[PDB]
Amino acid sequence: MRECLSIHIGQAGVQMGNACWELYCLEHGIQRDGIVSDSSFGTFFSETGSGKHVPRAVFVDLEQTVIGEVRTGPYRSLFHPEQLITGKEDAANNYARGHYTIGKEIVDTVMDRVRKMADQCSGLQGFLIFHSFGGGTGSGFTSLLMERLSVDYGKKSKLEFSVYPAPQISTAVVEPYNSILTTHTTLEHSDCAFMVDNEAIYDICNRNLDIERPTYTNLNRLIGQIVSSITASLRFDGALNVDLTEFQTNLVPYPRIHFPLVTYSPIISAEKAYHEQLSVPEITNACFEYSNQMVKCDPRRGKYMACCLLYRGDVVPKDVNAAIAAIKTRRTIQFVDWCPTGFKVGINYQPPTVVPGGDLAKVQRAVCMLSNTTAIAEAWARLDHKFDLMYSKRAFVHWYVGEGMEEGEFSEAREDMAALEKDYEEVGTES
Amino acid sequence: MRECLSIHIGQAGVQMGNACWELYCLEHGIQRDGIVSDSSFGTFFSETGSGKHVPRAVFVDLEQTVIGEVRTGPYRSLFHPEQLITGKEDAANNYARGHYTIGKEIVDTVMDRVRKMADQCSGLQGFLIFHSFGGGTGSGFTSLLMERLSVDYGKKSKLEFSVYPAPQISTAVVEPYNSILTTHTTLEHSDCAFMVDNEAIYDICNRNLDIERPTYTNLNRLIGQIVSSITASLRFDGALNVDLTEFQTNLVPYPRIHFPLVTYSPIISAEKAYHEQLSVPEITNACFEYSNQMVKCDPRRGKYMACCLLYRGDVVPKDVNAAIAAIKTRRTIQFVDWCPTGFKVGINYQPPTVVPGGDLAKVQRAVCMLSNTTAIAEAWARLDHKFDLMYSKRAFVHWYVGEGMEEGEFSEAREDMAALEKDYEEVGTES
Amino acid sequence: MREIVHLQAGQCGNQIGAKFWEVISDEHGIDPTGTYHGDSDLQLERINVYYNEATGGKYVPRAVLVDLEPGTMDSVRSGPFGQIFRPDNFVFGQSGAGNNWAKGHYTEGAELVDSVLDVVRKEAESCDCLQGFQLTHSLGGGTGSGMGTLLISKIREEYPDRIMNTFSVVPSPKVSDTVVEPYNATLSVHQLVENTDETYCIDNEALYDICFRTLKLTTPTYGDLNHLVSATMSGVTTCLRFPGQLNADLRKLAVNMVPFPRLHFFMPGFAPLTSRGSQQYRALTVPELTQQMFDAKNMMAACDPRHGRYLTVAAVFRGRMSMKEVDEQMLNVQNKNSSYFVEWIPNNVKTAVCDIPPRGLKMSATFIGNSTAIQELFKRISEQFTAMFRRKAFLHWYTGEGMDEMEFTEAESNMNDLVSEYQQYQDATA
Amino acid sequence: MREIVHLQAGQCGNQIGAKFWEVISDEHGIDPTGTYHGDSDLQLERINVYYNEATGGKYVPRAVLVDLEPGTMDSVRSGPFGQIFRPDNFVFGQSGAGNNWAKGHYTEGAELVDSVLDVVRKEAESCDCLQGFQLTHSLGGGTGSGMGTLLISKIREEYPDRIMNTFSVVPSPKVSDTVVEPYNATLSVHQLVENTDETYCIDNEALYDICFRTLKLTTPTYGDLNHLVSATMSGVTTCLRFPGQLNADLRKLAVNMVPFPRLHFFMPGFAPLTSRGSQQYRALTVPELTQQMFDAKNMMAACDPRHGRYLTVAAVFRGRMSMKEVDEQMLNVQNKNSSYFVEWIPNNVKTAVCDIPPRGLKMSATFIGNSTAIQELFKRISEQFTAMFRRKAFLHWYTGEGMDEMEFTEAESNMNDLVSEYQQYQDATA
């Protein structure tokens, strides 16, 4: 187990990155100035021959505003200045700009850094990519990087965390175009994508957590724990270690179906923690309830195809088997017929850490679930419906066309998206 | 290993010389007053029987302005007054003046000093010549010295550092005439020339270094490190010593192809140093990138014919072999077919020193590369194109003719230059 | 002297081996540094079986630890007994297998196969009379199933005469740890069914049950399950290491246990297993041990033996014993459980007794049974295999590593034959 | 007594010699000042082999240090053992060779050749029974390849009966240190192939490999590589310096090792080489040493011996030994590696044993092998030579020193014959 490289693209990805790297530093004990006041922090950090550890990340954006905060923020000393790549003019929520016109200018600079980062790795498990599914830079430039990375690093894991457009909440008018276009250009190249919706996490903050005034500092901070659970196996020892490539081997039965949804348990406030045991069954049963999943799509509306329970902390393997056995015998919880075995257990010894000032309570035992469910097809369909509803009248096509993109690309994108919907239908039925 | 003599001609060469000699004094610990507050500083210095060391250099110029600064500068006591030869009237950027009319008057005075300098040497490795390829004195008078030195000191190394005209930046209108004329008169006599462009070094100061206000005190100071790396083997001990004559034996396959380009790594600011390991592979890989070479010609556009990696400092021979092995297996980096072996390794123990007030950081490990690449033909061609574009209409020929030069010389110069371009074509192709 | 070389592949194999060598070293009185601090001279009488003696009394176990990723092996170095293994035997790769048999058998592990053989050959030459090899791994994993079978095929080609045992952890019936276990298990068995002489099938589900009820352990960790597996592993080789009234080496067990070459899959067992609460209330005598070993509640395999019949059974006792009691109790089991043995074998029990008991126990026994009930285990895996392969559930990962779909059907057909062969002998002449 | 005079040419030769005399002096218990402070009387029994005794017990090694430029030799003076060599033996020029064989053989070195012979002749006369000369240098350099061959031809003309060994560093296959090595190597070999009786080919690439994996040295410097080369150099001459059960002087090795006069290029080896981490885990016995010396991973030449066959092999042991173990292990290697020796030589191993071990080791061995695989080394150099000379890549430097192009083709043709001769004997009678 050796390096995994994290690429944070766009305002969403970068703001998630600083939350993630703040979490990484605390776990390994690296101060905010990069000094290490033992042998496992090399996966995400490089020792600068002086006791100073540099994160193995490339922060890319087309606007200086977001990366300017990091340069002037508390973690200014942490990051290598050359890694913080920034553009001149934002993508203006336009996929075509982020991909063709302004994206092409800065793509080479990013690849130059990635190659230098990759060369200093004895082993390179893969790439983590943090981006927003809806947006100019976070969706147009990531498609460029996915295409560029694939040719150079074929058959290396390329994980991505994507902010899928919420079914009901939206913060931009042309998201359906941006989201569908990026899906077309990443389906063939990406290995698997962990989907999270802002609306779903907002609901958790109100019901599970007692925070009545959540902010993106809360969503990103909570989302950071998801990545920590996924990469804990690389960075820590424990029974049933789960490497990075085991995810694509287990959670992706077919090449085009690689969009597992995210779930995390427990998520409880400090006051509400005193009244709960939080045993292995207690946390485990929460992961399979609609009230806790981080995508607003209802899992009960469909069937599962694979799951990976990334247990963490003071947990006992026997209880994991017993709790999992109880889940499989539920009639309400349905697993597709052609997959007799759906669970991919993983256990780690390092408990989750407590971020000072956070809204999450100290838990000596936590579980993170990654599940590939056909219910996510209900999310693509709404995106498809929202697309042709605008494209029929050419709602905003002139902006995209003028940026060096052809109208035919819109037709191809939906046609590829239409097949993806059909694929989930085919896999969800058995004789 | 014994004396190498440095001749600094023209404003460019002299201003480079004071930067170089400032560097030499600090390395050996000679104060600015020539006093030595142990056995290897005799290559470039002569002990004046009193504890005062005189540099073994001849500073020649046709205008008192530049040498007047040295006479009144901090190093006034350092140089032998008779060595600082100065003329009355500048060459006025005219090659003919610097060679025929005003050059002929002062040539004898220079040779008188050189002979006296040479006589006091038990062994004379060769001559270093610092000059500007474009200019009156730096290009016209150096041709005289090359012709005069060759007859007296046949088969002795005559190294030269030349400021090749930048492809895009230019500070004089008649450089193409001056540069081509000097090339014709030095091709047969010079052994090899290290080429540097002002535009290329300007780019490094902005990108690699963080200096937004570079000056010739920065270019010359950086250029001084190139000469120090080249002559460190003579002045210091270490595995794989590289004498002065090994350069002409290794980097010059054919007599007319002796124009290696310059490259130096690392070049990093103090602040940016904290975030880099600067291991042997890190510095080595930089030397072969277009972003660091000191000639704006793109190396990737051509093929290499020989290279000499002059490693320096706390370096390990095994890492040198491993790093070099990695380079040779690159497909993008191409070496000409008829040269199975291209690298000429050289390692020295003395680390580079830090010039107080400089823009370069303290590095315990540095590498300097001299490479003979066919891509330099793209630099001669632009000079050739810029020549006939003016000579067809006789843009400035009247100035040159009136100074005792014949028009036919212009035709011969380009014809010789044309063959040189053809030579690089012939060597760059194999069955 | 008779000598064995131990191979451990994957996370499961390496972690079992770590506990196994803790048990083996403790019995022979070896300090964690490798020095000998035992009290009885009989420990060094056959210490050559497992340990190569180095200068200064530092005994080095001849174990080869293989793992395509440094992770698991790194923890072994920092473990309590990490400093006993030879550093050069840690043949670790960089790119770990993604829990797919193809990568650990064709693409990645194939690059590391040559390196492992170099270490093994040196060990084999270090022996004066090599007996056989041991492999510890899991059939559900990628490296273990992949690298383990690749090693088995290669060493078999290079040591056809010698023996090779395989203590293989088998997928549990109810709860699984990996999604794609059926593909790995079916392919792995296709290699073991023809290349190994004896196998000791173990499943975590049975071991969890033993701790839950037979041992009353509230919080069992793999530090506990691997001890039971090690205890059985030590019992099988006790006769080699120590004397006894009636001995049985590895070859003796295989000849008696295996009627037909392809039916070489066994299910182990151990006794006595008693909780500290129930330790006081139970007498430790041969009759009590015999009942527990033949109890279906103590088998280390999920398959219930009562659902099938026994072809051959082997009980290896340890410690001070009475041969008359051993024969009487075996006679009782033979008659009482009349229908649990195939008639066409007149007697099915092969007994062996060793003088030295294990750890602080004064008496112990290890159970080995070649039941036909294990056909149920292979039946379930095939059913799960066909459920996925019917529509290529996860086949693109295997096909992308160089495997061909024709291999999957060949493995499926070969696996189906094994069940049919097992069912044939469950019948009786009359 | 039998006596040898050491010659070291160039940077490579001089620096190897400096480490070589540190090892030799340490074994005989010589203080850096030249005084003797040893403990065993057996050190002075044959100290005449290498050292001329001066007044006051100050033993002076009879080594001739030649270098066309003062640089390298100047550091030797300031080194730890600089004050042991005689000042007059430092025959240093001023104009160093520009890494071209022509300058070091015809123009510059030819002026210094006469001076060197004056020092050598005095040393040769100082001996009572001179055995042979030793030359340490590099084939890729200018002075070493040039001056070394010029010395060899001259001294051969003046000492035809005596022996001359040549420990020559040979260009590495992958990474080179000089651009024009092919020209120097091909010309140098053309001189050695007919003027020297035995050669010990060494390459830095193999030595780097030994340190990397066989010795686990993180930062190897030439202070480390030259020690391994010196260790082998000391082993070859141990029988002269110290007694043993079965001795072998320089002449004995050459007669046994060289079947045909032109096939006198060898590849050395040494054992035991163990990292401090792995030192504890390995037993030091004759069987262990034999495996390592014949291991292709320990050869000091890039060419893999398994790609060819052995014509003759010599293993010189040191320290307390058992002759039966030596014969048994050599018998094992002879039979086990059946196809690694040419049949037309019934037995290929020439053994020798010395009583005294080296430094603090209790047992050591030095390996010498006249493999036909070395034909690969000459094959590569010729291929590189023809690649450059096909269009006169760097020929103007050599032609300007007085050489003629006809010499290059003569050297090329002579070199091609050597490969053809090697290939002829790789065949078998049947």
Ligand SMILES: Nc1nc2c(ncn2[C@@H]2O[C@H](COP(=O)(O)OP(=O)(O)OP(=O)(O)O)[C@@H](O)[C@H]2O)c(=O)[nH]1
């Ligand atoms: N969870 C979370 N989502 C964010 C955050 N910041 C932005 N987003 C999401 O990003 C979506 C819009 O795309 P952005 O990422 O903001 O835009 P971009 O990536 O900078 O690309 P541009 O169009 O060039 O600005 C919004 O709908 C938000 O939901 C954040 O900090 N946390």
Ligand SMILES: Nc1nc2c(ncn2[C@@H]2O[C@H](COP(=O)(O)OP(=O)(O)OP(=O)(O)O)[C@@H](O)[C@H]2O)c(=O)[nH]1
């Ligand atoms: N790098 C560097 N280049 C210089 C420096 N000084 C002058 N030059 C270059 O010299 C070129 C013009 O020739 P000069 O050397 O200035 O003129 P000269 O050698 O004094 O000859 P004259 O024509 O007689 O003045 C300019 O294009 C500059 O690029 C210097 O200090 N550093």
Ligand SMILES: Nc1nc2c(ncn2[C@@H]2O[C@H](COP(=O)(O)OP(=O)(O)O)[C@@H](O)[C@H]2O)c(=O)[nH]1
């Ligand atoms: N009994 C036991 N089984 C284990 C242990 N560790 C892992 N396993 C089993 O190993 C299986 C996973 O395969 P694994 O060997 O980790 O994959 P590999 O590293 O590629 O060989 C799981 O189904 C676990 O049941 C252990 O310590 N004890």
Ligand SMILES: Nc1nc2c(ncn2[C@@H]2O[C@H](COP(=O)(O)OP(=O)(O)O)[C@@H](O)[C@H]2O)c(=O)[nH]1
């Ligand atoms: N093993 C070893 N090789 C060396 C050493 N120094 C130099 N070399 C080799 O010598 C070669 C260069 O030739 P060199 O002898 O320095 O040129 P010369 O001075 O004209 O003889 C390089 O290819 C190096 O590999 C050393 O200390 N040890």
Ligand SMILES: [Mg+2]
């Ligand atoms: Mg933006």
Ligand SMILES: [Mg+2]
């Ligand atoms: Mg001027």
